Every structure is written in structure tokens, then in C-alpha cells.
Design a protein around this ligand. Structure first.
Ligand code: ANM
Ligand code: K
Ligand code: MG
Ligand code: MG
Ligand code: MG
Ligand code: MG
Ligand code: MG
Ligand code: MG
Ligand code: MG
Ligand code: MG
Ligand code: MG
Ligand code: MG
Ligand code: MG
Ligand code: MG
Ligand code: MG
Ligand code: MG
Ligand code: MG
Ligand code: MG
Ligand code: MG
Ligand code: MG
Ligand code: MG
Ligand code: MG
Ligand code: MG
Ligand code: MG
Ligand code: MG
Ligand code: MG
Ligand code: MG
Ligand code: MG
Ligand code: MG
Ligand code: MG
Ligand code: MG
Ligand code: MG
Ligand code: MG
Ligand code: MG
Ligand code: MG
Lengths: 201, 176, 190, 136
RNA sequence: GUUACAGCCCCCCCGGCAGCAGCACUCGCCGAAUCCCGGGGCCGAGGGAGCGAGACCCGUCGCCGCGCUCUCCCCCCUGG
RNA sequence: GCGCUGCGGGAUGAACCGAACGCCGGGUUAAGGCGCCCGAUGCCGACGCUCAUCAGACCCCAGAAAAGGUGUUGGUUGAUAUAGACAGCAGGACGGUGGCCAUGGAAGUCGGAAUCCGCUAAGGAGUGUGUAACAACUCACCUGCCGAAUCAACUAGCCCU
RNA sequence: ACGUCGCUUUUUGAUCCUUCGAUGUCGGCUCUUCCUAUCAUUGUGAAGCAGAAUUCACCAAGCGUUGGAUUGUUCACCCAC
RNA sequence: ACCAUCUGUGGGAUUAUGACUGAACGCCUCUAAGUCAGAAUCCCGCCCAGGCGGAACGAUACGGCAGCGCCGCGGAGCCUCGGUUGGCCUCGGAUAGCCGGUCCCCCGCCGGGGUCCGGUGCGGAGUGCCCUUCGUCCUGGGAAACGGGGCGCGGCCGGA
């Protein structure tokens, strides 16, 4: 467990991930969800786009400014899904909702942190390989989200930096495997203690 | 009847109560597949009342004992003849199953009828169950397992322990 | 039911090299290289033999629908083998009653301009799919030659031309005017 | 792309259920969901067992389908699966997990002291290799 | 094609020997044919139970199940 | 039974399902549930069926029929087939005779009845196009190439119209 | 056609549940919004679609659907665009 | 004041439909997987408003010895709100596959590709890893001596 749970949204199903997140924020547990553009939704794209267009038709007739707010960003769509799964008209639910942060792409400071997945909501786990699915990024871009291209450009920049960091880790890890072989005589006895209790194989 | 759990084959033997007209009524033997012996006896009276003019009030359950599988360790192709009531009319079907036991195949049949035909147990009458040779099998779903050297992998193994751990940094592998 | 196994095997000519990157098929031949990605179909592709190669498509536990893609993949691969060996040549013929259809080829077969279709002052600019070269036949008039390695690109390019010359608001049983695919063949003859 | 196939003689490791953690041999295939398994040398009698609790290993025995447990036992002992399985990294990873869960409070103290020391000897040698590579 | 360089099935032999609803987690109903031990939780209502004598500091009392002594020996351990 | 009656469930609701009520603690249930709102499946639950560009989703109960689908899944009745089917690629599809009546026309093919025979591999008193009638094409039937299953009707589950 | 299955609440009936210590009744006028079972206009499929015109059907309600004589009229009917 | 005069606009995914490649079903087939064209509709742009939504930048209180800012983790004490009881400093992602490590070719001491070698119920493993708290004294080996510790100082580089 961690103080702040940072969840990568890529490859996850919207409702399944929302149910897990909604429970966690109700149990304290500040949650941060990133890459909400990468969230998937079961069913073919056109069905899901129809669902969200049908959501746009729901406006107060007398005064649409007071009516339902249709949020286009993948972050806000996921945020609204979680809100539907919370008692958001009570102080407890509102406090729970404040514990959730949603982001499109991975903004700093969460881009330099380990991101965890929820296998109970992963598309590869929950959907048969032959079922169609929709990307929240493409769906949002076609219902009025303006920053699909900017996010995609910044995500490509972030991925360039993260590979330099990974190459450095592989270099460091190759050296640490070299280090163990050099000093194996000086750490032999300590290795046996780890092997005896299963800490090493 | 409710096809609760796995079914058991019961050998039920019954007869009419002796009367001055008939001092030794004939004995009737039926194979009954029921969750328990209480249901097995109830199904026996339902069937012999349709076949003979024999009711529970005038009859007697002479014997009711479970029939154990005589080869539980050998896979066998079972043919089942049944009749059931659909939403419109009654139909006779012949179905094939592979199972280690006669009763497990009959239980599979009840699940299959529930799945492919929405057939509740109360609407199904099992007529004949018997082990059939592989050469006499008709359904391709069963016939495909008659290979002396059968070989197949297990593709796209789906993670089942999806909440242990609930949160992890590792995306699950499906190819094992 | 779910069938245990269903496989179809396609032969490979000695002059053709096929490499697999998972479900990606790379076919290399005298006319060029063709790549296709089959990640949308859960099948197993294997290469068999060393003196003469052979590609096998495997499908385990598929339903009736999943069963149908086995031959689809094999046909696609055979088309790719055809493309890199002999290529594809889609011949189009222009049919007109009164107004001749004037076709001029620009940008080395990349742009096809169609003029005087039905007498219209509208010039049709049809852009060929990449890797497809359009030319005007020299042996026979009113004929276009579409040549390329990918049946799908060559045939889609022909489809774009054919639906460009569409008669509207007129009885199309008469008014049989347009450019139509007349022959499907190969650049080289085996 | 597949390397491990369900077949007669394939040795599988049971993941969960009554026989969790035991090896069995596939004697016959009942249907798409169940197989007839028999571990004669592993104390698992012949019975039906779903493929969902079986993890295929890289061991195949040579006996005809639905053969008696006698012939399965002979092939199992002839190839000596028990020692071969123990030599695999798969089994060693399993026994390491058992040891780690078996650690008493004193053992955890002893392992930590070893960790405070071994990781530290490795850290200095890593720093030396940092400096040596920098100059070179 | 019918045991060969594997095996499967059926019938004969008190077929034998372990074991036995197995402790090899294949498939049951049970306990006058059933007993022992342990752990968690919630509670403590009532308040003169005395056939004993003249009950006196004091009802360690009724029912039920037991043990020792008013019999005498022997053995083991540290008079008990 | 409600009215005269709260309480658990049915989101909500006089009548439904469970159950009827002093003030409490512990235990257990009913009907009903156990992704999240929201207590409980965070079981490595079992076997299938279903893809919906209006999916579906729990008595009363709060939306649908006749009819249809070469979607798919079962099942029923037939038929063909290693003496060679089905598909596809090709040839024959004949004589009596233009069978009888009727009709202006009716030569297999407007209509009503008969619907038989040498000739083989087969060819009909014709499944259709076609002619005023013809002719002509074509179909069943059968043969060449081919080398394993295939064809027809019906039925009922989910889905679709 | 003979039959037969439906949908709608834009007619009328049927009913009498709500309102009789009161919910202002017809029509017009003005004004907004909504439905589609589309008249037109955009994209199309079909014809007994040569062209023109017209008819049938699909996606489709974005946009438009007028000026007058008689009538209190809703409705009609005619003149004209 | 149409009773004068001026100005009124571009994309995207797609519907119907028409198609490509192509099985199911040796043929065929716009569909099953895959792909294309596509409209007064839809969504966005243009345009109007601008969140109990942010941003960047300016100036920041004087003859009173006043008001203020910043530093000195400067010295205490006060009132007031409490939660928490080690850290993880990151490849991209695949899932009918993946991960790691090398000898050669080209992108210029990088990186990519081709072989080759290992691992894969993930052990270069989040079922993981790191750190670790009783303190001190005397005292001997290891380990280290390329060593620790200092908002100690100054400088440089990277991060929008
Ligand atoms: C025949 O047309 C009409 C008949 C009655 C009414 C009035 C009633 N309508 C509803 C109420 O009961 C009453 O309203 C009031 C204020 O009295 C209006 C029109
Ligand atoms: K009134
Ligand atoms: Mg809008
Ligand atoms: Mg807007
Ligand atoms: Mg069956
Ligand atoms: Mg967890
Ligand atoms: Mg016209
Ligand atoms: Mg045309
Ligand atoms: Mg008391
Ligand atoms: Mg009353
Ligand atoms: Mg009463
Ligand atoms: Mg009541
Ligand atoms: Mg209630
Ligand atoms: Mg309800
Ligand atoms: Mg209680
Ligand atoms: Mg219940
Ligand atoms: Mg509920
Ligand atoms: Mg809960
Ligand atoms: Mg059907
Ligand atoms: Mg429907
Ligand atoms: Mg009628
Ligand atoms: Mg009334
Ligand atoms: Mg009033
Ligand atoms: Mg009133
Ligand atoms: Mg009023
Ligand atoms: Mg008026
Ligand atoms: Mg309509
Ligand atoms: Mg409008
Ligand atoms: Mg008037
Ligand atoms: Mg004006
Ligand atoms: Mg467009
Ligand atoms: Mg085609
Ligand atoms: Mg289409
Ligand atoms: Mg397009
Ligand atoms: Mg504290």
C-alpha cells in the first residue's frame, strides 16, 4: 500500500476502473489516475460515441447553462464516471471525490513515479480478444476535446525522456550484475544466508 | 425437480399394494437421476403414474438405492434420449456427452438444455441413457476428441487472481 | 462448438522470402516488399521447411466466425506473394455514348484527371493510392492500366476512378457512361 | 508460437484446489475443459481435473492414452520426473517461496544483517566501476 | 491390421493380498453405530438455600457425580 | 389483505414477497441480495448461450404482435456419397410427337385433363426465358476433370428486422 | 380483395380516479420550444425512371412552410404567389 | 427604416448508400476479420458569454523614526486546526507472446537492425526491491580507506 495510489489509465476499462477507484477514495486512500485518454470502453466505437452524443442531448430545456455539463476531456469523463459511483451529494462523498485526481497524459510530478495497474479492470483480462472496444481519447476528441494533438505531442516527449532514464537503469543494472561477480568471494557467506531463507534463487 | 448440484443415479423399485384381486403385483424398476433419494422417489411416482395406472397411495417403494459408476476412471461417450416441453410444443432430442460417469453426463445434459434451450428441469424427461462407442458417436463436438494422439495448447490464459493483488506494477501475461 | 484445430498451409516460391514478426508478414520478391499486419486476428503463424519454405496458419478453439479468418489470412498472403512476383494490373475501360472521356495522367501516375464526363466542365482529380501507378493504354484506346503490388491498393484505386464517373439524376440503365474495370491480371505472366 | 501442448503424457503442475502444488500426468482428455490426470508417484489418484488449475510443464511421458496407473508409474519412474522437476528453476522458485514464508523472527533478523552487509559490499564495487568507467 | 518393439476392453479363476467411504482430498448417508480438546464474541438476572441444634466469629447449603479414612500390606519419588 | 399497520425486500408505491411491533444486548434467518453508490462473492465458482449503428438485465410492474433472417447455436425428418457426392470448370439434354381435347394462334412451355414407350449415360409428354406459331436459349436428368463429406425441409434458444 | 396482426392519443366515445370554502371555457392574435408518421430543401436507393416531369423507399426535423375574400369560427372553400 | 447602407465562414468522424480486398460455403459475396468514398444531420472551428478555474507581468504605503518585505530552519513562550506512525527517483508496451545480454552492419562515441546466447508460471520477480532505531564504553578480526559528515561555501548542468 502507498499514501497516494498512482494508476496508469492505459488499457483499463472505464467502469471497472471507476468502481475500484470509487471504493478506494471512500476508504481514505488518495488516488491519482493518469493517461485517462488511454482508458478503453467495451463495445465498438460507434456504439460508445452514440452513447455520449445521447448524453449531449440532455440539457435543461428552459436554460442549458444550468443543465448537465458535458465534459469533453478524457480526465473529466472518467471523473464523472467515478462521481456517479459515489454519494456525491453528501459531505462524505464530496470529501471522497476531492481525494481523486485525474489527468490526461502524465503531468509532473507523477511522470517520475511508478504507476500501478488494476488487473481487475484491464482490457486484456476482462474482454475477450474478439470483442470491439473504444479508446476514450478518440471518443473525447470527436465530442469536442481540443487537446488530443497537444497531449499526444507531450506524451511523445515524455516517452523520449523515460527511455533515456531506462537505458541508464539497464546500464546501472548491468554494472550491479558485474559487481556481484567481482565480489562474490567477499559476499559468498551473505549470499548463503539469503539462499537458505529463500531470498535468492 | 431442481437439478441442484450434481445428480445421482438411483435405482428405484416399486409395486402396487397387494390386493385380493392381485396378491403378487409385478415389480417395476426405473433409473432416476435426482439430487437426493427423496426427489428420486417423487420422480418415480411421477413416471410410473404416467406409464401405469399406479399411484403413490396404492403403491409401495420396494427399494431405492444409489447406483455407483462402474468405471469412474474411464472417459465414456454417453448418448441421452430425452423429451422436453419448449414454449410451443414438445420435442424429442438425442444428445451426446463425454464424461467419467453416467450421472455427470445426465447433469451436463440438464445444464446444456438450460443453456441452449432455456429448459427448466421440471420440463425435461430423460428416457434413455447409455454409453455408446466412439464409432457410433454422431455429434462433431464429441467426435473430435476421438484422437489417439490429441494435441492442443491453452491459448490466452486469462488471469483469474484479479484481486490478489488488486493493485500491481506488473501488467499480466496471457501466454504461458 | 469450438473446433480444436483448423489449419491451412500456403506454399512459397523459391524466389520469395517471407519473414514473420509475430503476426506481421513481410513478403520480399523481385518486384519489391509487402508488409501486412494481422494483429486483429488471434492465430498462430509458422514457417515450415528449409529447402522449400511453407507458411502455416493455425487456429485453436475458434467459433464459426473465428474459423472463417483462417482462409482469409491465407488468401491475403497468397495475394502478397502474387504482388511481389507478378504484380497486379487492373485494366479500366472508359464507356461513353456521346461525350468522350478524356483522361490525362499527372505526377507519374499518381494523379488522374478525368474531363468531359457527361459533358461536365468539372475535371475529376483522382489521387492514386501510394505504390499504384496509373497509365493510359497504348495498344487500345479508352483503356487505363493500373499497376501495383498490393491488390488492395490497386483495386481501391480503380474503385476510386470508377465511382468518380457516376451518373446522377439520370436513368443509369441508359447513360452507361464511366470508366469501368474490365480485366484483372498481373504485370508479369507466369 | 506455442511450445507447451496438452497431450497424453504431458506433466502438469497443479496450481490450486485440493492437489495444489503437485505434479500430475495427463492420461486422457475428456472434453475442452477437463482432462483425466494421474499422479502415481506424486500421491494424486486418477481423476478428472480442469485445465484451469493446471500449469503445463516441459515434460512429456510416453504411454498410450487411458493406460493403467501401473504403466504411468513405470514411465514416470523411468524418466525420473521427481528429480528432474526438482532441478528446474520453476521448482527452485517454489521452494524459495516456502522458505521465505517459513522465516521465523530470528531468521528475518539474520537475513537483514546479511542484507545490510552484502548490498553494501556490492554498492562500493558499483561505485568503483562507476569511477573506473568514467576515467576510461 | 488385432500384440508384434505399446496398450485398451470383456469373460473364467475363493482369482489372491493389503486397504477400505483411505492417511492418495475419486464418488455417500450417518452416530445409544461419538467422544476429547481448543479459540473468538455477548452476558452475570437472583440474593436469609441452616431439620443442624437450642443454630452464637460464620448457612462452603440442596440435588447430582466422585475421592480418602475409620482394614492391612507392597512399590516409586523427594515427614510430603 | 388494505382500511386500523409499523417493520425487511420490490429505487419509488395502501394492497405485492417475507414478516406483523413492549424497551435492549448477543446469535440466526425470511423474502431479497452481495461491481460501485450500498451491508454482502476481493470465490483463481461450474457448464453453455448472446454482439445489438433502438443489446439485455428479476412476481405484482410499469411497453408490444402477426410476420421474417444464408446471424449463430442446438435439435427433428428425409436425401446423395470413395461403384466418386456437394461446389466449381465443360459436353449431351434425344425418336415416336407438333401425345389428346380445346384454341385464330397453341409445335414441352395461354387452358383442362391424360404424364407412355424402342434408344443409351441421360433426356421430361418439360423447371424457366422466348416466338403469332416456330425457332432459339436453358432446366431437371447424365457424362468428363475433381477427391471428402454434402444437400433439402422443419423446429426453438439468444440476437436482429 | 377475402382475412388477419399492430401502433398513436392529433377525433369521438366509454369510465368518474383528481378538482364544486372555484385550476377562468371557444377562437384569433403574439411568442417560444418540441415531435415526425418529410411538403420543400441536403445526401441517396427503386420505377411501368429516354429527357423533362412524376411516383415509391432510406438517412434526415438543420431550415423553411406565406399574402387575402366569406365565416366568431377550429374546420372548410376559393383567389394569388 | 429592406424606407438608406454594410457583413454573414472552415474542419472532422461518419448516416443512408455505393464500393475494395475477402472468408464463411474450393464458387460467390460491401462484412464475418480488415479497407474506401460519403451528406441541409452530428461534433468542433468562426462567433457570444467567461468557473467558489488557472497564467504572466507591474507597483507595493517615511521624516513618521512610521508601515512593510526578505534572510539569519535567531531566541523563546501564546492562542488555534489536526491528520499521519519508513521509502520506492518513472521504459515503452505486448498478450496467438514477452524480457534480458553479446559479435557484426548503419544513424555520428551514442542508438537501430541481423545473428547468437540465456530467462519465461515472469526471480534483472511490486507474491518485488531499498533502508532500518536501543545508545555508549573497552576491545579483535572482516569490510572500507576511489571513505564518511557539514541550507559549510561558491560555481556549473539538467527539468516548463
Ligand atoms: C365547461 O368548461 C369549464 C367547466 C368548468 C370550469 C371550472 C372548473 N375547471 C376545473 C375546476 O374544477 C374548476 O375551476 C374553477 C376555477 O372553478 C372551467 C371550464
Ligand atoms: K369544481
Ligand atoms: Mg454544443
Ligand atoms: Mg462549445
Ligand atoms: Mg450435444
Ligand atoms: Mg492490494
Ligand atoms: Mg429524370
Ligand atoms: Mg459510371
Ligand atoms: Mg447478582
Ligand atoms: Mg374510513
Ligand atoms: Mg385486523
Ligand atoms: Mg401489513
Ligand atoms: Mg421498504
Ligand atoms: Mg420497481
Ligand atoms: Mg439483533
Ligand atoms: Mg434467498
Ligand atoms: Mg440493492
Ligand atoms: Mg461493500
Ligand atoms: Mg434461428
Ligand atoms: Mg428487440
Ligand atoms: Mg383489409
Ligand atoms: Mg371527471
Ligand atoms: Mg383562482
Ligand atoms: Mg382549490
Ligand atoms: Mg391559475
Ligand atoms: Mg385570424
Ligand atoms: Mg423516419
Ligand atoms: Mg428546429
Ligand atoms: Mg369575418
Ligand atoms: Mg434594413
Ligand atoms: Mg468527410
Ligand atoms: Mg468480392
Ligand atoms: Mg457499409
Ligand atoms: Mg472514410
Ligand atoms: Mg502523534
Amino acid at each position: 500500500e502507498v499514501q497516494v495510489l498512482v494508476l496508469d489509465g492505459r488499457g483499463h476499462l472505464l467502469g471497472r476502473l471507476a468502481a475500484i477507484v470509487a471504493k478506494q477514495v471512500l476508504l481514505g486512500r488518495k488516488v491519482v489516475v493518469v493517461r485517462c485518454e488511454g482508458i478503453n470502453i467495451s463495445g465498438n466505437f460507434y456504439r460508445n460515441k452514440l452513447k455520449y452524443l445521447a448524453f449531449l442531448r440532455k440539457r435543461m430545456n428552459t436554460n442549458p447553462s444550468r443543465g448537465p455539463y458535458h465534459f469533453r476531456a478524457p480526465s473529466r469523463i472518467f471523473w464523472r464516471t467515478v462521481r456517479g459511483m459515489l454519494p456525491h451529494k453528501t459531505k462524505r462523498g464530496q470529501a471522497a471525490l476531492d481525494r481523486l485526481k485525474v489527468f490526461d497524459g502524465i503531468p509532473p510530478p507523477y511522470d517520475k513515479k511508478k504507476r500501478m495497474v488494476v488487473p481487475a479492470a484491464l482490457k486484456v483480462v476482462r474482454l475477450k480478444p474478439t470483442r470491439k472496444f473504444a479508446y476514450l481519447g478518440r471518443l473525447a476528441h470527436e465530442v469536442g476535446w481540443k487537446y488530443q494533438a497537444v497531449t499526444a505531442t507531450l506524451e511523445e516527449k515524455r516517452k523520449e525522456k523515460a527511455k533515456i532514464h531506462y537505458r541508464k537503469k539497464k546500464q546501472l543494472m548491468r554494472l550491479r550484475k558485474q559487481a556481484e561477480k567481482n565480489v562474490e568471494k567477499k559476499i559468498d557467506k551473505y549470499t548463503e544466508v539469503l539462499k537458505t531463507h529463500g531470498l535468492l534463487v | 425437480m431442481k437439478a441442484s448440484g450434481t445428480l445421482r443415479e438411483y435405482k428405484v423399485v416399486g409395486r402396487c399394494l397387494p390386493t385380493p384381486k392381485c396378491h403378487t403385483p409385478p415389480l417395476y424398476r426405473m433409473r432416476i437421476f435426482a439430487p437426493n433419494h427423496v426427489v428420486a422417489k417423487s420422480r418415480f411416482w411421477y413416471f410410473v403414474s404416467q406409464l401405469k395406472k399406479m399411484k403413490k397411495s396404492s403403491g409401495e417403494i420396494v427399494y431405492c438405492g444409489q447406483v455407483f459408476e462402474k468405471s469412474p476412471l474411464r472417459v465414456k461417450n454417453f448418448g441421452i434420449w430425452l423429451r422436453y416441453d419448449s414454449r410451443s410444443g414438445t420435442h424429442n432430442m438425442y444428445r451426446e456427452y463425454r464424461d467419467l460417469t453416467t450421472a455427470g453426463a445426465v447433469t451436463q445434459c440438464y445444464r446444456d438444455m438450460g443453456a441452449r434451450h432455456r429448459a427448466r428441469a421440471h420440463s425435461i424427461q430423460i428416457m434413455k441413457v447409455e454409453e455408446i462407442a466412439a464409432s457410433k458417436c454422431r455429434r462433431p463436438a464429441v467426435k473430435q476428441f476421438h484422437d489417439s494422439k490429441i494435441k492442443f495448447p491453452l491459448p490466452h490464459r486469462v488471469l483469474r487472481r484479479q484481486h490478489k493483488p488488486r493493485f500491481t506494477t506488473k501488467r499480466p501475461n496471457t501466454f504461458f | 462448438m469450438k473446433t480444436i484445430l483448423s489449419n491451412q498451409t500456403v506454399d512459397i516460391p523459391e524466389n520469395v522470402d517471407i519473414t514473420l514478426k509475430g503476426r506481421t508478414v513481410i513478403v520480399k520478391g523481385p518486384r519489391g516488399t509487402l508488409r501486412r499486419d494481422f494483429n486483429h486476428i488471434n492465430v498462430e503463424l509458422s514457417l515450415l521447411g528449409k529447402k522449400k519454405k511453407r507458411l502455416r496458419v493455425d487456429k485453436w478453439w475458434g467459433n464459426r466466425k473465428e474459423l472463417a479468418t483462417v482462409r482469409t489470412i491465407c488468401s491475403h498472403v497468397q495475394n502478397m506473394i502474387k504482388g511481389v512476383t507478378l504484380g497486379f494490373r487492373y485494366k479500366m475501360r472508359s464507356v461513353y455514348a456521346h461525350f468522350p472521356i478524356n483522361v490525362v495522367i499527372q505526377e507519374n501516375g499518381s494523379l488522374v484527371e478525368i474531363r468531359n464526363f457527361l459533358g461536365e466542365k468539372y475535371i475529376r482529380r483522382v489521387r492514386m493510392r501510394p505504390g499504384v501507378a496509373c497509365s493510359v493504354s497504348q495498344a487500345q484506346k479508352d483503356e487505363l492500366i493500373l499497376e501495383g503490388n498490393d491488390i488492395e491498393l490497386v483495386s481501391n484505386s480503380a474503385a476510386l476512378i470508377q465511382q468518380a464517373t457516376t451518373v446522377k439524376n439520370k436513368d443509369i440503365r441508359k447513360f452507361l457512361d464511366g470508366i469501368y474495370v474490365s480485366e484483372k491480371g498481373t504485370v508479369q505472366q507466369a | 508460437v506455442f511450445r507447451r501442448f496438452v497431450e497424453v503424457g504431458r506433466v502438469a503442475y497443479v496450481s490450486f484446489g485440493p492437489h495444489a502444488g503437485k505434479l500430475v500426468a495427463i492420461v486422457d482428455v475428456i472434453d475442452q475443459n477437463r482432462a483425466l490426470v494421474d499422479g502415481p508417484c506424486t500421491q494424486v489418484r486418477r481423476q478428472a481435473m480442469p485445465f484451469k488449475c493446471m500449469q503445463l510443464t516441459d515434460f512429456i511421458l510416453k504411454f498410450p492414452h487411458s493406460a493403467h496407473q501401473k504403466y504411468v508409474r513405470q514411465a514416470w519412474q523411468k524418466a525420473d520426473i521427481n528429480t528432474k522437476w526438482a532441478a528446474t528453476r520453476w521448482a527452485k522458485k517454489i521452494e524459495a517461496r516456502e522458505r521465505k514464508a517459513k522465516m521465523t523472527d530470528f531468521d528475518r533478523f539474520k537475513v537483514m544483517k546479511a542484507k545490510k552487509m552484502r548490498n553494501r559490499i556490492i554498492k562500493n564495487e558499483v561505485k568503483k566501476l562507476q569511477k573506473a568507467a568514467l576515467l576510461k
